Amino acid sequence: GRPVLYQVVAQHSYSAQGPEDLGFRQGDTVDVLCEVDQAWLEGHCDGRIGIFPKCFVVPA
Numbered sequence: 001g002r003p004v005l006y007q008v009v010a011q012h013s014y015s016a017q018g019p020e021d022l023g024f025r026q027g028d029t030v031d032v033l034c035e036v037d038q039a040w041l042e043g044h045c046d047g048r049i050g051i052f053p054k055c056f057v058v059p060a
Contacts, residue, residue, distance in 0.1 A: 022050030
């Protein structure tokens with residue numbers, strides 16, 4: 001299992017283009033699973049797991 005580092009809140013919406021992407025709505029809570037890169041995070045939301053830009057979320 002992937003432990004949840006912390007939760008973040010989406011400040012901007014984001015639509016997933018492929019299966020590696022995590023999409024979400026503005027206001028969704030996201031469970032961060034990996035601090036991938038300077039600009040990318042891996043997380044879970046609504047059963048889905050994927051990566052997304054760090055600049056779309058703020059700490060929960």
